[PDB]
Amino acid sequence: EKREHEREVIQKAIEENNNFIKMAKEKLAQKMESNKENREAHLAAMLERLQEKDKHAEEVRKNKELKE
Amino acid sequence: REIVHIQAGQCGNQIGAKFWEVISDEHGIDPTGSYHGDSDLQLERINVYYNEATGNKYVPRAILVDLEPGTMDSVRSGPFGQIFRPDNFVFGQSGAGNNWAKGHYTEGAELVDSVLDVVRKESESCDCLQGFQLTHSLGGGTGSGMGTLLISKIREEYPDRIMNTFSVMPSPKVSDTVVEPYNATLSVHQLVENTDETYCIDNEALYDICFRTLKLTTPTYGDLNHLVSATMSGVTTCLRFPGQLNADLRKLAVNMVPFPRLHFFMPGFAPLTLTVPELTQQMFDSKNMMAACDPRHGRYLTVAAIFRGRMSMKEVDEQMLNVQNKNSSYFVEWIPNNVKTAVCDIPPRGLKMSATFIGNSTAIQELFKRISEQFTAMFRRKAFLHWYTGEGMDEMEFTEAESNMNDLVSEYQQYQDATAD
Amino acid sequence: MRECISIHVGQAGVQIGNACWELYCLEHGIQPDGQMPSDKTIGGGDDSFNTFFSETGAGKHVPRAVFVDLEPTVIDEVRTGTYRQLFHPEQLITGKEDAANNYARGHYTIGKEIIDLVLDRIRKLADQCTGLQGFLVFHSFGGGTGSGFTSLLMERLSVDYGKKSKLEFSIYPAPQVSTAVVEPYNSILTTHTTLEHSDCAFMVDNEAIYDICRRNLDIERPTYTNLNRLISQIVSSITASLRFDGALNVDLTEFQTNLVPYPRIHFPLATYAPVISAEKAYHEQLSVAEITNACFEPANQMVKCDPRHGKYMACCLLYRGDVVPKDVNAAIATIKTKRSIQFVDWCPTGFKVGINYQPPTVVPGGDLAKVQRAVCMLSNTTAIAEAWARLDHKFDLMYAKRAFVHWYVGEGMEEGEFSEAREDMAALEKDYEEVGVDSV
Ligand SMILES: Nc1nc2c(ncn2[C@@H]2O[C@H](COP(=O)(O)OP(=O)(O)OP(=O)(O)O)[C@@H](O)[C@H]2O)c(=O)[nH]1
Ligand SMILES: Nc1nc2c(ncn2[C@@H]2O[C@H](COP(=O)(O)OP(=O)(O)O)[C@@H](O)[C@H]2O)c(=O)[nH]1
Ligand SMILES: [Ca+2]
Ligand SMILES: [Ca+2]
Ligand SMILES: [Cl-]
Ligand SMILES: [Mg+2]
């Protein structure tokens, strides 16, 4: 019974170390993915606003063109 | 690392030429592009503003833009005119007639792609571009309208780079052109959205300095641009020489801009033509600000101070702590340690010591209030609007620019009123 | 066997590494070209100094160290400086664009582009070890690289080496030499993210070092060089047990056993003595009693706080030089009867003592006097939470208005990370209160 308990203790140490490594890996993957998504979203919104500005400039030149 | 410099319009090109003359002298570059300095400190970060070409020649990473050839022809004939890359001159013939709409939507829109070709060519040969600095005025047509259009286009192509402007504010004291409040409000509307940091070079302040302080009865544009060049050298010292603090545009922006829209800086210089206490006191003096605002009418969000010359760093630290402790009411208490100080051993030309001040103060709302008052006085009577509606613009655009600038002022007021408790 | 790998991250980490490795070479008789005439085993060995230096067949002793920075100007001075021959080029890793004092850029935007290369070079060092004991990570709290890239590296190191020991030397921000307003943000973010992955962290308050230099060395305006030479003396005191042998030499891990009662309570307060100018040291021999007394004067601490208004959970004295146990015991006896040393009721009040016989060395042209004996005290005191309190207060002042937060959000961070890190810091302050409360 003592031998069985010894095997159990060492297996539990291995399991806890492996689970630490696993949860660290997964949290880091989640953080990097969420961060990539957020930064790409901000850049996309910025470029969309700039394209709306370009569209408005097109509209302005049109409005001048039909003023003649 | 590398900064790309663009100067647009008459004012933009004149103050840019003076800037290049001043910093070429500081870095030991002669008008032919050859180095003849005496300190390796001059060359350590020379690559920030200069490309290196064959024969160990140094060529400004500079792009010269205008809708008329005159000012750029005079630049090419100026003292350092031959130092610029000839292909980096991009000019049209139509002119802008002091019309923001012509600069932004029509004539400038026709010219902007050939400017972008040169911008792209300069950026592609950058080891690691930090971003761009633009010199222009807000009162004219080319600088104002086409500069803001260029800012938007460049931001479209380089969204993760820092956009920095030196923007000259109009004043009845200097120019009589009546549509300048329109041009300036339309420009500020763009800058609030598409620049990361903007040095407000207020022509009102330059005039008042030359008149009251320098005793120049009839100040010329030369006299104003002398102040502008000294201030620009001051504010770019940390970018141009080895150093710890605000050594690149992004670190400067991170230190100076607590909220994205509040990025309009009040520059100051001392001495206006000796001891460290005198330098510090004068650099915080309203009479030394290049924006016509009294800082004691508002609160400082962030400040950067640059001391140049051989002086006691202990005394510099003591005096900066002294001014902060003795004027704490004027620094927001919810941004701890918001004053950063750099010291460069190399003084500007002709001086043994100098100090340059960069303040993000809520008092800049006095500048924007002045511009808004002059704008509204004309807009409520719809004066001269046909110059703009004739280019395809809508009155709604004027209303929106007015609204946005009023919002900016109210935001400065909100953070001036904010309290820690 | 028992190798330690040093990783120096950012400007502060790299320059402190510069000072530390120069001091190590002086302490071991290693020339700038890596040669060590006194080492008679060429190309290998299991001497004590081999915990920190590997050996080439040509006789060069190479630091088990990686230097990492996201911009190249600081490591370029290593590449061109005095000890350039010491390192292999692959140990000095640089990017082109720094993190601009932005934790988010150090951890995510820029850091992600160099992290795999850094881990690869660290693996190359680890494969040379027959019995790696762990890592020593040098970094600032305030810098973008020092905070964010350090946090990224620590997470990745936990993944690549499990529970293998990781110690920090962390530069705590001080307004006298700080370069960023957002340094409180960066400090709290990196402390939160690193807390689970660090086994022991030695905080160095730049203000404390600054004041020690001004007061004890009469330096009017201390530079990073002054600060780093002092800091390297403290680091050398801490690593001397790993780098030298002796019969009274107690291992750092054995000190660590006493210094970390709870995994989160792993921030020892370091105190170092003596810090004296050569002009004052001349004809003034400082005794074991004098330097041991100096260990309990707050003015000599690496972190500003008042242990006299806190409780001790551990007290370690690390002597180097001409020191014997009889004199140590006499001085400790004197101090107990005379000082405000209050322990928590669940810990023994003894002092753990280690003595390394090899005397302290000073870098030529430095400010520190060469002394015959010195001591570094590592104590676990609840007072260290004062530094967390100051940092958290500055954080709260700025975050209540969301000042500068847009710079982080723009790089992909969320406000929730700010609030989560701040809650972790609040829980840490609570932990330090709880460990100090008496039992019932
Ligand atoms: N003691 C000491 N502190 C330093 C040193 N260099 C920088 N620091 C401190 O570290 C903080 C700034 O962080 P840095 O290490 O310079 O920034 P970084 O790691 O290069 O990160 P980046 O933002 O990408 O440049 C400030 O608090 C400085 O006071 C140094 O050599 N010695
Ligand atoms: N400080 C300074 N201000 C100028 C200069 N030139 C023009 N300004 C101002 O700039 C405004 C007109 O802008 P301008 O550049 O001349 O028009 P543009 O060439 O079409 O862009 C007016 O308010 C002028 O007072 C100059 O050389 N120095
Ligand atoms: Ca004009
Ligand atoms: Ca050997
Ligand atoms: Cl020393
Ligand atoms: Mg750095």
The domain ranges of chain C are 1-268, 269-383, 384-440
Q: What tokens does C157 get?
A: 């190191």
C157 contacts C126 by C-beta, under 8 angstroms: no
Which CATH number describes the domain made up of B259-363? Answer: 3.30.1330.20
Provide the pairing of β-strand C352-356 with C200-205: unpaired
Asked if A57 lies within 8 A of B109 by C-beta distance, the reply is yes
DSSP letter at C350 equals -
**Please, what sign has the CA dihedral across residues C153, C156, C158, C164?**
negative
Which CATH number describes the domain made up of C269-383? Answer: 3.30.1330.20
Q: Does the beta carbon of B268 sit less than 6 angstroms from any atom of ligand 2? A: no
B410 is in an annotated binding site: no
Rounded Cα–Cα distance for residues B101 and A47 (Å): 23
β-strand partners of B133: B5, B164
Ligand 2, atom 26: closest residue by C-alpha: B11
Q: State the catalytic residues of C.
A: 254
B391 contacts B337 by C-beta, under 8 angstroms: no
CA distances from B96 to B181, B341, C115 (A): 16, 42, 51
Q: In this complex, is the C-beta atom of C197 within 8 Å of any C-beta atom belonging to chain A?
A: yes
Rounded Cα–Cα distance for residues B188 and B264 (Å): 10
Distance from Cα C101 to the centre of ligand 1, integer Å: 9
User: What b/e sequence results for C115-151 when a residue is b if at least 16 CB atoms lie within 10 Å of its CB, and e otherwise?
Assistant: beebbebbeebbeebeebbbbbbbbbbbbbbbbbbbb
Burial label for B405, CB within 10 Å (0-12, 13-18, 19+), is: buried
Rounded Cα–Cα distance for residues B383 and B386 (Å): 8
Closest CA to B353 of B284, B306, B307: B307
Pick the CATH number of B1-258 from 3.30.70.2660, 3.90.480.20, 3.40.50.1440, 3.30.465.10: 3.40.50.1440
Rounded Cα–Cα distance for residues B267 and B199 (Å): 7
Structural domain total, chain A? 1
Q: Does the beta carbon of B99 sit less than 6 angstroms from any atom of ligand 2? A: no
Of ligand 2's listed atoms, the one at least distance from the Cα of B146 is 21
Of ligand 2's listed atoms, the one at least distance from the Cα of B66 is 19
C11 is in an annotated binding site: yes
Rounded Cα–Cα distance for residues B140 and B221 (Å): 15
Q: What tokens does B255 get?
A: 């230190």
Rounded Cα–Cα distance for residues C266 and C199 (Å): 7
Closest CA to C188 of C419, C430, C16: C419
Asked if C181 lies within 8 A of B254 by C-beta distance, the reply is yes
- CA of C101 to nearest chain B CA: how many angstroms apart? 6
Q: What is the best residue among B18, B65, B168 to mutate for testing ligand 2's pocket, by most ligand atoms within 8 Å of CB?
A: B168
Cis peptide preceding B260, ω within 30 of 0: no
Which CATH number describes the domain made up of C1-268? Answer: 3.40.50.1440
**Cβ neighbour number for residue B328 with a 10 Å cutoff:** 9
Shortest CB distance from A61 goes to which of B156, B392, B394? Answer: B392
Taking CA–CA distances from C197, the nearest residue in chain A reads A24
Backbone torsions φ then ψ of B33, nearest 5 degrees: 90, 5
Q: What is the best residue among C171, C182, C225, C230 to mutate for testing ligand 1's pocket, by most ligand atoms within 8 Å of CB?
A: C171
Q: In what order do the strands lie in the sheet with B162-169?
A: B89-91, B62-66, B2-8, B129-137, B162-169, B197-202, B264-270, B353-361, B300-309, B339-344
Domain boundaries, chain B: 1-258, 259-363, 364-421
Rounded Cα–Cα distance for residues A63 and A65 (Å): 5
CA distances from B320 to B130, B303, B323, C125, C210 (A): 30, 11, 5, 47, 18
Which CATH number describes the domain made up of B364-421? Answer: 1.10.287.600
Domain limits at A35? 1-68
Collect all residues of chain C within an 8 Å Cβ-Cβ radius of residue A28: 152, 155-156, 159
Q: How many residues does chain B have?
A: 421
Shortest CB distance from C108 goes to which of A20, A21, A35? Answer: A35
Shortest CB distance from B152 goes to which of A50, A59, A65? Answer: A50
DSSP letter at C36 equals -
Q: What is the distance of C-alpha B73 from the center of its chain?
A: 23
Asked if B159 lies within 8 A of A63 by C-beta distance, the reply is no
Q: Does the beta carbon of B65 sit less than 6 angstroms from any atom of ligand 2? A: no
All residues at 6 or more sequence positions from A56 whose CB lies less than 8 Å from its CB, including other chains = none
Asked if B156 lies within 8 A of A65 by C-beta distance, the reply is no
Ligand 1, atom 7: closest residue by C-alpha: C12
Q: Does the beta carbon of B323 sit less than 6 angstroms from any atom of ligand 2? A: no
Cis peptide preceding C274, ω within 30 of 0: yes
Distance from Cα C324 to the centre of ligand 2, integer Å: 80
C140 is in an annotated binding site: yes
Pick the CATH number of C384-440 from 1.10.3720.10, 1.10.10.60, 1.10.287.600, 3.40.50.980: 1.10.287.600
CATH number at residue A62: 6.10.280.30
- Dihedral-angle region of residue B308 (phi above 0 means left; psi in -120 to 50 means alpha; beta otherwise): beta
Rounded Cα–Cα distance for residues C362 and C23 (Å): 7
Within A1-68, where are the H helices? 2-65
Method: X-ray
All residues at 6 or more sequence positions from C33 whose CB lies less than 8 Å from its CB, including other chains = C60, C85, C86
Distance from Cα B388 to the centre of ligand 3, integer Å: 17
Residues of B with CB under 8 A from a CB of A: 101, 104-106, 109, 152, 155-156, 159-160, 193, 390-394
